[PDB]
Write a structure and sequence with these properties.
The structure is a monomer. By secondary structure, the chain is mainly beta. The protein has one domain: Calycin beta-barrel core domain (Lipocalin, Beta Barrel). Helices cover 12% and strands 52% of the residues. A hairpin with a 3-residue loop joins β8 and β9. α1 runs antiparallel to α2. It starts with 12 loop residues before the first strand and ends with a strand. Keywords: Acetylation, Cytoplasm, Lipid-binding, Phosphoprotein, Transport. One of its GO terms (cellular component) is extracellular exosome.
Length: 135
């Protein structure tokens, strides 16, 4: 009560993998080995995001290691993939609890819905999806 001065929703929180679709098709296409794919779809990972005003931290716990990144929105930084490949880009927000970023041919769209994180990525013709839930 008595809060949110024309600003609401918050990417700050920790989350937990519920489900994912096109995972194997995407992981094979980005050149990961079948070992990391079979453990990556079986073992449900954890995920964490920290909003820091203009700054944003991304943390994704796979079934063996965590990938940590940081950027500032509208500033030109880099993001690490699960394969360990390093790629420069800029991230934007459409004012509607949804971040958007592209790379070369990969169109990534994160979406916060309360205590749920929807995430939809589109590399070429492959459409990777991922759902996590805020613990």
């Amino acid at each position: 009560h008595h809060h949110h001065h024309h600003v609401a929703m918050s990417f700050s929180g920790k989350y937990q993998l519920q489900s994912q679709e096109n995972f194997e098709a995407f992981m094979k296409a980005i050149g990961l080995p079948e070992e990391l794919i079979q453990k990556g779809k079986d073992i449900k990972g954890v995920s964490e995001i920290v909003q820091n005003g203009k700054h944003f931290k991304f943390t994704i716990t796979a079934g063996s290691k965590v990938i940590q990144n940081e950027f500032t929105v509208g500033e030109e930084c880099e993001l690490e993939t699960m394969t360990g490949e390093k790629v420069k880009t800029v991230v934007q927000l459409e004012g509607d609890n949804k971040l958007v970023t592209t790379f070369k041919n990969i169109k990534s769209v994160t979406e916060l819905n309360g205590d749920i994180i929807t995430n939809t990525m589109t590399l070429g013709d492959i459409v990777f999806k991922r759902i996590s839930k805020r613990i």
